[PDB]
Design a protein around this ligand. Structure first.
Ligand SMILES: Cc1cc2nc3c(=O)[nH]c(=O)nc-3n(C[C@H](O)[C@H](O)[C@H](O)COP(=O)(O)OP(=O)(O)OC[C@H]3O[C@@H](n4cnc5c(N)ncnc54)[C@H](O)[C@@H]3O)c2cc1C
Ligand SMILES: Cc1cc2nc3c(=O)[nH]c(=O)nc-3n(C[C@H](O)[C@H](O)[C@H](O)COP(=O)(O)OP(=O)(O)OC[C@H]3O[C@@H](n4cnc5c(N)ncnc54)[C@H](O)[C@@H]3O)c2cc1C
Lengths: 395, 395
């Protein structure tokens, strides 16, 4: 799984072939990353490659023409992709991740799930969840959206606005959360991309190519068949809970960006020799220590990541609920650790690291984003604490 | 000195007037910072304001028409300026700082110093030191420059290339270090801006408006009168050592950027209220802790900064040499601390902090630069250790 350290020999034939694919895609995305980050535009060509490679249906079940891939293997590819370009990796990770979430949970009604899965496999349709609003902050904090959903003859009229709508230029389907006006309950709703207005607001420090714009919905119709859930008193969304394990795509992406940073600084340190030294800066003690620290951080966070993915794939829905606090833990570890690794990479390279002609400054910008995908650090510590308190109590 | 905490009442009339000036300039530079950072261009209008305000001659001695300002007061204004815009503050800090260095050291021959000072006071001429080259890294590490200076009838022909040439578009005078070919010794040389070729290479993560381009010198003549020093065996550069105390302009600039960040996040936290809370996020425990941590960092680093400046102004040249390790210490403290403060500011604001429509992401970019102005962190710790070892030995 951590093949770059432990060798590819372990892996089976078909995984090795899949890995050649993602490594090629990553290398292409890398060549194209500078210009897209400079323009802050959306990389339609990267999405076309993902679609033609088949990647976009890798997590769709085998019963609908997908590959049914494990979470562990999906993370591996996401990490490879992010090492090429983080914006693209993170955008597509929402898609493949969400399909795995739906696959493992039965959160979608069977008819709706089958319909969505078809469009992915036969048309390359892409999906994402667009729930963030200014008024609520992170949906993970539990705020009722001001996006309102009003009951009409065929289904619901949705009116509102969502921010950070990743992948939106290339989306077919959008899951949108909204409060049902008259009843005071939250619902989730599957909207077609064609019925919303993208307002091109995304202009950011990093992850500039995710296309995470605003979407505006003005009286948008959702037919009853496309209503995902309405969370009334006494209802489960997920028929088989997954403990949000799919959200592990987040740490995998930000570690991938960190490995790119580490690789650049290692290459740079190995070859840069000022006229003050008889050897390259890789042999200077303080540089060596920073190099070694990067290594430790990556080792720890990645080992934890893949260990937890591997447990997720073997676990029952009850065991997956119990692992949720650890899934948060690895997110907080890996994203903070990713920031620190790029920081150190930059210190190794020095003043030259500020140069836009090298990719290292883009890594520093891109990696920042992981701090603000869910779950949040304070929530992660809290839930870790509460789970520890419950284990004591169970004794 | 830290008037924002401790009140302006302490300060004398003429300092208060000077402070009104720098605060106005800072506020202008702030209004103009977004567009200059987006274009990565040089702010000629900010330099014109500095010149018309008189700031550029503030550190020139009173005997040549300057104000002769203290290092302590100079830092105060530099901090105010940087809080408006860091690129401009840091660029001008080289000028005012270098004049104070020359004033306090007699490093320039008297005739040359008087000539330079005249041009500053009567024409607004600007000066900087341009010594960095790819081949040497930081000049502070002691590398012989590949820029070579060859002895001719009138003086020297200089041929070479320098990087990170801050303020270069607006410079009149440039101090350039070069190795004297035949003799194998390093010299410093005062070059006119008109005799060099600026190659517009500066394209950076932050401090994008410093104009720190490459300068190319092809057979550039320097007349004997403009030769600053040639460091042969048995020669002092500085007739009265200053222990490099002027380099304190660096920490002051990066703390100024940190205070801007802290101010934004405080304002934001005070007013942002999601629908998940009965109060603004400033009253959330984790946000409050981050707010308080920023405060502690600034308190400590700034107090140290101004304490050391105040000692520098009272100290003899022998005592200034002894304080050199502490001047490094405050640089390492304040620049690292500035990075951490902006980091926390960003965590307080959240995902919104990535937005280019707010100035906070520019602060994160700008503050990075301080890690690579001298002295370097490993050198600072080493010299702190060696000074401690010598104090023990003196017992
Ligand atoms: C690259 C990127 C891609 C994204 N993609 C998507 C996407 O595809 N779909 C989508 O829906 N969203 C997306 N988002 C948005 C993301 O999911 C978050 O909703 C957003 O970043 C805001 O969360 P926050 O906690 O940073 O800020 P806020 O929730 O605005 O919080 C700001 C500050 O207040 C604190 N805070 C707020 N409320 C509380 C509370 N109730 N209790 C304690 N503390 C609180 C936070 O900890 C933080 O310090 C994306 C963000 C990024 C950076
Ligand atoms: C905003 C900004 C403005 C600047 N303005 C100016 C200016 O006006 N004039 C000017 O001359 N320069 C200027 N510079 C350049 C600056 O002075 C440094 O020379 C430059 O940043 C390179 O130093 P460094 O230590 O980062 O990188 P390098 O010296 O290239 O070192 C790279 C890495 O190797 C290490 N290293 C290198 N050599 C040694 C050694 N011998 N022993 C131990 N470790 C070593 C460093 O610690 C670092 O990890 C500016 C830089 C910035 C960011």
């Amino acid at each position: 799984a951590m093949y770059d350290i432990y060798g590819e020999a372990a892996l089976p034939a078909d995984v090795r072939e899949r890995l050649r694919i993602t490594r090629d895609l990553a290398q292409a995305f890398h060549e194209r990353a500078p210009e897209h980050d400079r323009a802050g535009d959306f990389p339609f060509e990267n999405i076309e490659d993902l679609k033609a490679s088949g990647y976009v249906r890798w997590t769709v079940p085998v019963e609908y023409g997908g590959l049914g891939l494990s979470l562990e293997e999906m993370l591996m590819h996401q990490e490879v992709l992010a090492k090429g370009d983080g914006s693209t990796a993170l955008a597509i990770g929402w898609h493949v991740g969400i399909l795995l979430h739906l696959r493992e949970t039965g959160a979608f009604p069977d008819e709706l799930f089958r319909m969505v899965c078809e469009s992915v496999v036969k048309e390359g349709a892409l999906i994402n969840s667009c729930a963030t609003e200014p008024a609520t902050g992170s949906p993970s904090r539990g705020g009722k959206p001001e996006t309102t959903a009003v009951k009409v003859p065929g289904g619901y009229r949705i009116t509102g606005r969502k921010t950070f709508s990743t992948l939106s230029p290339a989306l077919t389907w959008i899951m949108v959360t909204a409060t049902v006006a008259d009843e005071d309950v939250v619902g989730q709703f599957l909207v077609r991309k064609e019925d919303v207005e993208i307002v091109e607001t995304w202009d950011t420090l990093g992850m500039r190519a995710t296309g995470s714009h605003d979407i505006v919905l003005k009286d948008v119709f959702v037919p009853e068949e496309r209503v995902i859930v309405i969370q009334r008193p006494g209802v489960q969304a997920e028929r088989r809970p997954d403990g949000s394990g799919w959200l592990l795509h987040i740490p995998a992406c930000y570690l991938g960006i960190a490995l790119a940073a580490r690789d650049f600084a290692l290459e740079y340190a190995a070859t840069y020799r000022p006229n003050t030294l008889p050897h390259p800066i890789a042999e200077v003690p303080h540089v060596e220590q920073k190099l070694g620290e990067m290594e430790l951080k990556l080792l720890a966070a990645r080992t934890l990541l893949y260990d937890l993915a591997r447990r997720f794939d073997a676990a029952s829905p009850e065991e997956r609920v119990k692992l949720q606090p650890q899934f948060g833990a690895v997110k907080t570890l890996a994203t903070n650790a990713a920031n620190q690794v790029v920081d150190l990479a930059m210190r190794v390279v020095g003043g030259r690291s500020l140069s836009r002609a090298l990719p290292l400054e883009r890594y520093y910008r891109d990696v920042r984003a992981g701090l603000h995908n869910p779950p949040m650090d304070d929530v992660v510590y809290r839930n870790l604490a509460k789970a520890a308190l419950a284990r004591r109590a169970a004794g």
